[PDB]
Amino acid sequence: STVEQVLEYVKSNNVKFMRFQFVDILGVPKNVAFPIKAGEKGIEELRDVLENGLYFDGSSIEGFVGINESDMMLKPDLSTFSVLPWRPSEKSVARVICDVYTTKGKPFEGDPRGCLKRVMEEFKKEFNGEYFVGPEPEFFLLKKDPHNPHKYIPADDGGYFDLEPMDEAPDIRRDIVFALENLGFHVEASHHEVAPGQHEVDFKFDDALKTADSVITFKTTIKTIAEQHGLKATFMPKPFFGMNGSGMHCHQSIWLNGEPSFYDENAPYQLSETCMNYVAGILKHAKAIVAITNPTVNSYKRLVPGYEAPVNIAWANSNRSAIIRVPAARGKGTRIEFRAPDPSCNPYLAFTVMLAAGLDGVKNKLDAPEPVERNIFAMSEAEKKELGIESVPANLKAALDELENNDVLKNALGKHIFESFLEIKNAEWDSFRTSVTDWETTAYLKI
Amino acid sequence: STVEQVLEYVKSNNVKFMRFQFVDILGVPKNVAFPIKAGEKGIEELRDVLENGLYFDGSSIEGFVGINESDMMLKPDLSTFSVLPWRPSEKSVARVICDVYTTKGKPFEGDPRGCLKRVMEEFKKEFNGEYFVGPEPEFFLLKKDPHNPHKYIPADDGGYFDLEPMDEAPDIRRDIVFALENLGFHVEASHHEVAPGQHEVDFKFDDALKTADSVITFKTTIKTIAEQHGLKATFMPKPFFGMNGSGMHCHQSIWLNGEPSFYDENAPYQLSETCMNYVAGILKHAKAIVAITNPTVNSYKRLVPGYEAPVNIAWANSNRSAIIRVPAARGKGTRIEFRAPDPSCNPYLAFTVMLAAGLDGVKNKLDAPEPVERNIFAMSEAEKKELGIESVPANLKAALDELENNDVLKNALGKHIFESFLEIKNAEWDSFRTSVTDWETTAYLKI
Amino acid sequence: TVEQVLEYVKSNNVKFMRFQFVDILGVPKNVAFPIKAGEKGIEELRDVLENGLYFDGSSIEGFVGINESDMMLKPDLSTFSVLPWRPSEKSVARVICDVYTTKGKPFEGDPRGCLKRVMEEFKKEFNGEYFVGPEPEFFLLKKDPHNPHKYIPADDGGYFDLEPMDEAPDIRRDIVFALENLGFHVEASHHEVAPGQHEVDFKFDDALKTADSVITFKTTIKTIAEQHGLKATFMPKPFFGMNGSGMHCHQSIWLNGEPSFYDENAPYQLSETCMNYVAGILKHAKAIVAITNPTVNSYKRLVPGYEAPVNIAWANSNRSAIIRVPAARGKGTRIEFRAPDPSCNPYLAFTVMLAAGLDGVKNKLDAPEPVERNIFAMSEAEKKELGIESVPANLKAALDELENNDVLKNALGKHIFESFLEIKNAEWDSFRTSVTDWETTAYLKI
Ligand SMILES: O=C(O)CCC(=O)C(=O)O
Ligand SMILES: O=C(O)CCC(=O)C(=O)O
Ligand SMILES: O=C(O)CCC(=O)C(=O)O
Ligand SMILES: [Mg+2]
Numbered sequence A, B: 001s002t003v004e005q006v007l008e009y010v011k012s013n014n015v016k017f018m019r020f021q022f023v024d025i026l027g028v029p030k031n032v033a034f035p036i037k038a039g040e041k042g043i044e045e046l047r048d049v050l051e052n053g054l055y056f057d058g059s060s061i062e063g064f065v066g067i068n069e070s071d072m073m074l075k076p077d078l079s080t081f082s083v084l085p086w087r088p089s090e091k092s093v094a095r096v097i098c099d100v101y102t103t104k105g106k107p108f109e110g111d112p113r114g115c116l117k118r119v120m121e122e123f124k125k126e127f128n129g130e131y132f133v134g135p136e137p138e139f140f141l142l143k144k145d146p147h148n149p150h151k152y153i154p155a156d157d158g159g160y161f162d163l164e165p166m167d168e169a170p171d172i173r174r175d176i177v178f179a180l181e182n183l184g185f186h187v188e189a190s191h192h193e194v195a196p197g198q199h200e201v202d203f204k205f206d207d208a209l210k211t212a213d214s215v216i217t218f219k220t221t222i223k224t225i226a227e228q229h230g231l232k233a234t235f236m237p238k239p240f241f242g243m244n245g246s247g248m249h250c251h252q253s254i255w256l257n258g259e260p261s262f263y264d265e266n267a268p269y270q271l272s273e274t275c276m277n278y279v280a281g282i283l284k285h286a287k288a289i290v291a292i293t294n295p296t297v298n299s300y301k302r303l304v305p306g307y308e309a310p311v312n313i314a315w316a317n318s319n320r321s322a323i324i325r326v327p328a329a330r331g332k333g334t335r336i337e338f339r340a341p342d343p344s345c346n347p348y349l350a351f352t353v354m355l356a357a358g359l360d361g362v363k364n365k366l367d368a369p370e371p372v373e374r375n376i377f378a379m380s381e382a383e384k385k386e387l388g389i390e391s392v393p394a395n396l397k398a399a400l401d402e403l404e405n406n407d408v409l410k411n412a413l414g415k416h417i418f419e420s421f422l423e424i425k426n427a428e429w430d431s432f433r434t435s436v437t438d439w440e441t442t443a444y445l446k447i
Numbered sequence C: 001t002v003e004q005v006l007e008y009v010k011s012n013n014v015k016f017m018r019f020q021f022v023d024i025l026g027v028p029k030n031v032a033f034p035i036k037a038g039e040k041g042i043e044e045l046r047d048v049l050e051n052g053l054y055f056d057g058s059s060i061e062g063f064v065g066i067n068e069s070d071m072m073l074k075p076d077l078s079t080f081s082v083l084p085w086r087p088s089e090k091s092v093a094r095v096i097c098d099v100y101t102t103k104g105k106p107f108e109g110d111p112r113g114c115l116k117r118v119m120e121e122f123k124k125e126f127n128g129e130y131f132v133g134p135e136p137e138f139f140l141l142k143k144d145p146h147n148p149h150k151y152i153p154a155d156d157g158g159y160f161d162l163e164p165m166d167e168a169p170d171i172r173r174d175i176v177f178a179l180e181n182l183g184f185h186v187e188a189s190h191h192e193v194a195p196g197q198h199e200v201d202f203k204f205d206d207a208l209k210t211a212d213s214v215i216t217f218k219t220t221i222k223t224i225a226e227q228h229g230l231k232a233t234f235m236p237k238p239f240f241g242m243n244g245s246g247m248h249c250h251q252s253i254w255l256n257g258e259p260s261f262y263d264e265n266a267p268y269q270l271s272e273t274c275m276n277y278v279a280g281i282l283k284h285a286k287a288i289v290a291i292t293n294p295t296v297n298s299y300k301r302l303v304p305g306y307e308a309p310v311n312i313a314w315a316n317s318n319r320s321a322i323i324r325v326p327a328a329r330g331k332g333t334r335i336e337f338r339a340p341d342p343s344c345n346p347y348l349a350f351t352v353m354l355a356a357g358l359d360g361v362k363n364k365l366d367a368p369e370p371v372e373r374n375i376f377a378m379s380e381a382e383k384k385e386l387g388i389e390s391v392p393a394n395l396k397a398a399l400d401e402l403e404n405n406d407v408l409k410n411a412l413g414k415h416i417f418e419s420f421l422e423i424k425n426a427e428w429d430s431f432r433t434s435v436t437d438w439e440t441t442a443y444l445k446i
């Protein structure tokens, strides 16, 4: 946490390189390595770079600054120190996640990490609360297709919770869990998922900032370790048609005055008014939240309306057909599971929009709808229309238009992130709608 | 034209087979061959089948009837008799396009050919008019990719109007023109088009029914002759990205009382009020007409808003940037060119919706907007919004919703064609939005 | 107890705990929990060992719907074991669990709990102990050198053959060590009649301990074979024109801590209880084969009209009948139910066998005379006169018999009985609609 503690770990573990890590607007991690010199002179050089930070070209980073005003800085968060395990042990490489700051030493407006810090500090100042998140980011382990090396296929024909040799990833998951534990993660469980070659490594919930720092490190940990075992890991929301997609279910809850505010022993379903107001806010801005939490064109092939997916804007207890599911655990573990996100989203912006829409419901005391205990997939469109169960947008452009007209998320993300995200994603959407796809060639070349 | 004239040709020219041709809802031609026997017994058998028609399973044809009411008939149109040239000369194979009729001998409601006959007879009864159309259906000649035989590429690296050997299709176009002339076509011109391997074979204008019969025979003629020269012809609206797409510009005009009603010697641009009322009607239902005239998902990659295409809903004189272009020819040849269609559409339904929207403007005497002589592609979106130049839908589903809410085209096509077309195209759209495309795999597998 | 498990984990450096269970088809399913260092890791492991953990039940075959997926696992601490094939440094251990609902009640559709229920009902009513000893045979395969997409047997060997004719003494050496480390009492290991077919026998125990060892055995043979560059299969008939994988079930019931099947002063030294139990198995034989032989391929080994344990009759030391009474007497007196194959769920296989047998013990049903003659040498007209009926010829024929059988419906329960028939009817439909390679060979020429 302090400068002295970080420098003490450098001497103990024999750290030789310090990675000053951060994230671009789309959530892609970016970093620069600093070599630590031997003796006290190297320790005190590292101290200056840890306290004052270092400069970098901001124009090359996505959604940051123009070429005419490119000079920027990185101020390290000393609480996020971690030794990278996949790197060598002798002359080890450690990391330090930083906050992007302007030349004048002021936090950068277009920084996703600073955006999440801002809304969390505002929440702690106004309500004395702590926003806790616990995601379930799923991924696919791939191998080259033997019939064609240019294409990739799943690593095994395994199912949900399957055992070896049907599940060919116990060794890959073993090293992933060991690597995460060394990085400071509290791993809860690991297993094979529904689709072939799909896996899920869960970890303990924590405050939104520590959880978002963990999601970035988790994605790198999964990809780097897969390359060591001759495989390629992908967090694509739907790499293959006809099989389950990678989903990042976000279990979340707010604790006002160090108490579980979502729990109420004397209430319906043992859920407090604060919980219902929060759920109402998420459901209100659901069509706009999916623009940030599902930012790829491929995300709307997993999260596809009219088909089995968490597309139905409604909440329910122990039901995976609705967008929100309230797990049966009560007391401290009382929470809500927002099932719409996929691991393709920027965690810093995903937790910001979820907390902003949720707090909009708490501030205004919005009324939540009744829980749809029935299976929503079995219902007909005329029946769902009578109940008022609306669906999330069918494509990326449909979600961007909803985000653009939403003022709650515009204020939470800020003018810089809101406008740059829409501009980057509209160019991405335009590239998709103009390209001639393989489906079109298969269906229309014969005509 | 009469039964005796057809049988007299069959007797002398040694015709052995008679193809009873027709089209499904999507415009795909369908036929059954009838062998003609020698002597008077064979001619009297053919006479009965020509006058009374023959039965067929309607459930197997797309957008026709259910399995529980499948029995249907084909009543030949003796005016469309033609000798297929690509077939042998000795013991030749002749064709006769037919009207689909129900078991009770009544014209089938879901027949595209009967749909066009109905609206033309209604126009001739109400106004004493004749609807003339002259299309320019472009196509691509393809060859297998040498680096991969599973994919196809253009036959040559030729440009617009290029000469041999740069243009490698003079021999292919030569045989196409000879085949069309034998089928009764009045070929006007033939040449290489802008994109590599793209070509265009133009033919004289005629009444909508004779023109739609010619478009079906043209598509078959271009594909069969290409297979003879070891190539594969495709009428796909956009087979390759980054190069021009196949467009079917429809030059059209209406003649009330055997006179060119679109021409007016003493008027602005030498164009009559009837012409302006017709143009106003096309521009009014432009967003709904493109559902029929551009029925494929790929059509919206050629006809793509925001990019160089005939997407801007406006008319202009000798300007190819607008949806309508008024060619400089005057007098009898005074006409309007609807540039939005591509050869993937059903010609019988395309001419029906164009005549219905155009006549809606003539009946109500709608006011047309001013001609946009300026290049519309060079204009900015804010400038086009001030002028009021709206754009055609960006995708197939966006056009189907416009067609569904349009009552003018619903009545012209009829309940059977209107509902079956929307149902077939919505299932086609759902297949596209759920499939994982090659673009998505290229862009998101790395994440 | 909880402390016994925690003390082994503390000293031996165990790092992963597999919470294992089975779906309706007997396919094993599990999730790994990482054990942290120090007292904090041991206290975290204590919580998850006593209270259990949650899992998506809808994704498991034959469990619950999507709108009611919250389910838990309650570890049976007596089933603790170290997985030998996994690494020794930072070792991996397992714990077989019982599926429980959100309300903390045993799940009705759980196969393991289904066997516990009938065993506890038996010990409460008759004070008995149901002992079973299976012989789950398997096939070690290798890719066909003429085509890598197909698999063939590993060696051109025979029954009990010696190396180099038998090329699996190295593979069976490691299978026996792996099972010994898991806590198995291995009795014999050898090659079987067909090429590449092998057998590893283990000592009998109570039906639950045996069913846990059947799941652990199936995984052990497959993981050890994949280490030696081969692929093991417990398919009931992978190749035509040779023996199939059979899982003979040597079973017996001990009322009041004594061998009730033995009677020193009786015919064949077999008690009245044994003859009543055999009469019950033969009565429900047409229905038991639906559970003990649930695959379509099972009826290609267990094929009527051809040499197999298809004939519904009993005999001493005769392998032609469905039941064979081994010549061992005293404590080792038992009956061998020969129809089963290693493709079945053991928990459901022992449940239907005990329930059908106890139906004969409760009603005191009379068994027929033993058919000491070779049944394969008999004609169909002779077998009809004696009353020797045969087991169903296909999967769908067995599912109809199981559906009408009320004795096995109540033993499996409304949840397991209905989901099994639904899963197997959909499986049968997939087979009868598909155009098989036999049809292409016989009818493409016409
Ligand atoms: O496979 C896992 O999920 C974690 C690692 C493990 O259990 C193992 O090494 O066997
Ligand atoms: O090439 C054409 O467009 C028509 C055929 C022709 O002119 C030729 O045979 O050279
Ligand atoms: O082959 C067997 O059955 C057990 C192992 C053995 O005997 C050997 O290692 O030679
Ligand atoms: Mg999951």
Ligand SMILES: [Mg+2]
Pocket (backbone or CB within 6 Å): C445, C446
């Ligand atoms: Mg024949």
